[PDB]
């Protein structure tokens, strides 16, 4: 039973709160309410023969809650920075979170990068080749997730556990 603290960061309306629902309860709501402050869950998965336990903190993405961030990642051993592929600016904001994570968070944190809403390739604005580049340059764990089709949701989380 190795217990770790995880925190989802990113701009609002990217899919942070929905990824958690897909990762835990395996559901999805097209009309989800916005996260006020932060919600707390604990999900237990077992890689190989060893059990790990996540202390998940789904944060609020609005600009106001930015000052409350260090409370959420101070003891985090992992951080998922979620952006939208249908919004270039959300990805541009994710760059600031990572760069802020690198500055202020724990030096041994397993930062992950996620490009969500990947099912909306119709309105895709960010390029997968670009994000994969920026990630590989910044030592991140980049995938393309989709809480609407369960794509890479369980994959990105457990991929962090491998490094844990």
């Amino acid at each position: 039973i190795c217990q770790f603290k995880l925190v989802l960061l990113g701009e609002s309306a990217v899919g942070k709160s929905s990824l958690v629902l897909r990762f835990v309860k395996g559901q999805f709501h097209e009309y989800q309410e916005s996260t006020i402050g932060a919600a707390f869950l604990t999900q237990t998965v077992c890689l190989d023969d060893t059990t790990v336990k996540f202390e998940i903190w789904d944060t609020a993405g609005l600009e106001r809650y930015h000052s409350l961030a260090p409370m959420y990642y101070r003891g985090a051993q992992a951080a998922i920075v979620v952006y939208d592929i249908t919004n270039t600016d959300t990805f541009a904001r994710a760059k600031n979170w990572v760069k802020e994570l690198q500055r202020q968070a724990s030096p041994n944190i397993v930062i992950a990068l996620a490009g969500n809403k990947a099912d909306l390739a119709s309105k895709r604005a960010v390029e997968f080749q670009e994000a994969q580049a920026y990630a590989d340059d910044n030592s991140l764990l980049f995938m393309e997730t989709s809480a609407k089709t369960a794509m890479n949701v369980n994959e990105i989380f457990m991929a962090i556990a491998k490094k844990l």
Partner: protein, 530 residues
């Protein structure tokens, strides 16, 4: 729906509570005992915002001259100079009082003050308001009719007082007003409007008055005893609007020792609403917006105060007992860890007992000052203030506060301290969840994170974070039905049997801290005392 406001000196007061109700207990209290209480509510302005008022026994009378909107100057003259003993009219020697004379002084009091309120109304009178003015005007005529037929003119309060001081004018009064029937009927047996001023006339008067001054008239409700049905009845402005005020007030104060029982509209027997001690409840209101007043006997008063001073001394003793244990469980005693407002006003009758035939003006003004000081002392317990905003959000329920996270104009300091509070609560509810499952593994982990929030994010002082953490520990210990304390007692005992320091040492210390210290503004360590 409370808010938290930063004060001029960097502290955090919470929004003052608003009381819209007032209820007086049915007991062996005299009307003089409620004088200091009203004088206090006036001085602090707790009366103007009252919508409803209730009472039984002598309270039913006191709550009736409040609902009529009598000025606090007249009430002082009325309450101080009105011996009920004067208003006893036995049918003869060896008999109990009729209860007709006490009922008639009430009607005079009401008609004098309900008249001076109609004179303040602005003429003409609106169509849908045309009726209500007529009925009230008709009744006062009836009262002024009979009174003129007896040679008594009442347009002052002092006229009512000296009226009582003369049996001649008193018997004149009884012959006059008793003529007025209690129940008018006629084909087809339908009930006709009661010729006396009723509970509903209080509602009629108020609709007439401008919104500027509609606050002068309160919703009156009294409680009596039904000696036939052997239970309690409640007469209200809303429920029984056709019921005379002077009837139910005399009824509710008709002790079977001094007064003959009354006659219900069915003929059932009716007496004092406080033969046994009873606290009425105002229907349509919450508990936390109603001021409750109870008069206790002298011995009954001191007994309650002493058993409170005692359990507050033990709270400090048990802490020192734990610190002196170093170098018997925390259910001792009555430790309330969430904030609940105290609206209970206790009044010491003292020497004005029900046995005291006649009290000296010495021990009368004593019974007044007690009710004044005690009412003031209680109101001083509604003013919440804290040194740190998180302490307020933790001690007072976040369900009892206006959500600042949703508010876009809420100050950053309160908006941040609220997020700090929901994080701790998240952890608090997890420790409880896991301990009940049987997993006590991350208990220390979660508590370390809680303390970390208090000291890093909240940036509390080293001493005001002790109180904050202790409360967080006490609250979890409460929410887990003691599962935390027991587990904390094992770990520490399993660490002394290994000669090694433990983490459970400081957690148990705070767990045993006096609650009277953690919610205080005491700037010192746990040498709180009293």
């Amino acid at each position: 729906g409370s808010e938290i406001s930063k004060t001029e000196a960097g502290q955090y007061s919470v929004s003052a509570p608003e009381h819209k109700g007032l209820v007086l207990s049915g007991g062996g209290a005299k009307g003089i005992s409620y004088l200091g209480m009203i004088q206090a509510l006036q001085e602090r302005g707790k009366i103007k915002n009252l919508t409803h008022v209730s009472g039984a026994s002598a309270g039913a009378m006191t709550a009736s001259i409040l609902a009529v909107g009598m000025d606090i100057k007249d009430i002082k003259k009325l309450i101080e100079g009105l011996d009920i003993t004067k208003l006893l009219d036995n049918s003869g020697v060896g008999f109990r009082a009729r209860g007709d004379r006490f009922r008639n002084i009430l009607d005079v009091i009401y008609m004098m003050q309900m008249k001076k309120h109609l004179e303040s109304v602005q003429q003409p009178i609106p169509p849908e308001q045309q009726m209500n003015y007529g009925i009230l005007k008709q009744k006062i005529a009836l009262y002024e009719d009979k009174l003129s037929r007896a040679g008594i003119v009442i347009n002052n309060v002092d006229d009512i007082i000296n009226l009582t001081k003369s049996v001649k004018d008193l018997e004149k009064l009884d012959k006059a007003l008793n003529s007025i029937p209690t129940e008018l009927k006629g084909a087809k047996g339908e009930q006709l409007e009661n010729p006396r001023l009723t509970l509903g006339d209080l509602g009629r008067l108020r609709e007439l008055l401008p919104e500027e001054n509609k606050h002068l008239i309160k919703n009156l409700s009294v409680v009596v005893t039904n000696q036939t049905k052997h239970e309690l009845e409640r007469y209200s402005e809303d429920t029984t609007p056709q019921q005379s005020i002077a009837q139910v007030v005399q009824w509710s104060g008709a002790h079977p020792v001094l007064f003959v029982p009354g006659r219900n509209a069915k003929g059932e027997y009716i007496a004092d609403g406080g033969i046994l001690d009873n606290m009425p409840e105002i229907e349509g209101l919450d508990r936390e917006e109603v001021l409750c007043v109870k008069a206790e006997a002298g011995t009954a008063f001191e007994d309650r105060v002493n058993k409170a001073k005692q359990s507050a001394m033990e709270a400090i003793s048990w802490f020192k007992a734990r610190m002196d244990s170093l170098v018997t469980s925390s259910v001792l005693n009555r430790e309330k860890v969430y904030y609940n407002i105290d609206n209970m006003i206790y009044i010491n009758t003292g020497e004005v007992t029900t046995t005291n035939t006649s009290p000296t003006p010495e021990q009368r003004a004593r019974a007044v000052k007690n009710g004044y000081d005690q009412t003031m002392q209680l109101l001083d317990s509604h003013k919440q203030t804290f040194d740190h905003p998180l302490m307020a959000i933790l001690y007072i329920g976040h369900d009892k506060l206006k959500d600042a996270l949703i508010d876009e104009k809420s100050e950053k300091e309160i908006f941040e301290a609220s997020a700090h509070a929901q994080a701790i609560l998240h952890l608090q509810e997890q420790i409880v969840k896991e301990m009940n499952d049987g997993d006590y593994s991350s208990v220390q982990n979660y508590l370390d994170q809680i303390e970390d929030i208090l000291t890093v994010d909240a940036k509390m002082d080293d001493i005001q974070k002790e109180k904050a953490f202790a409360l967080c520990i006490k609250q979890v210990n409460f929410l887990s039905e003691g599962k935390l304390e027991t587990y904390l007692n094992k770990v520490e005992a399993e660490a002394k049997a290994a000669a090694e320091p433990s983490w459970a040492t400081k957690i148990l210390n705070l767990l045993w801290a006096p609650i009277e210290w953690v919610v205080s503004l005491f700037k010192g360590p746990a040498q709180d005392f009293k």
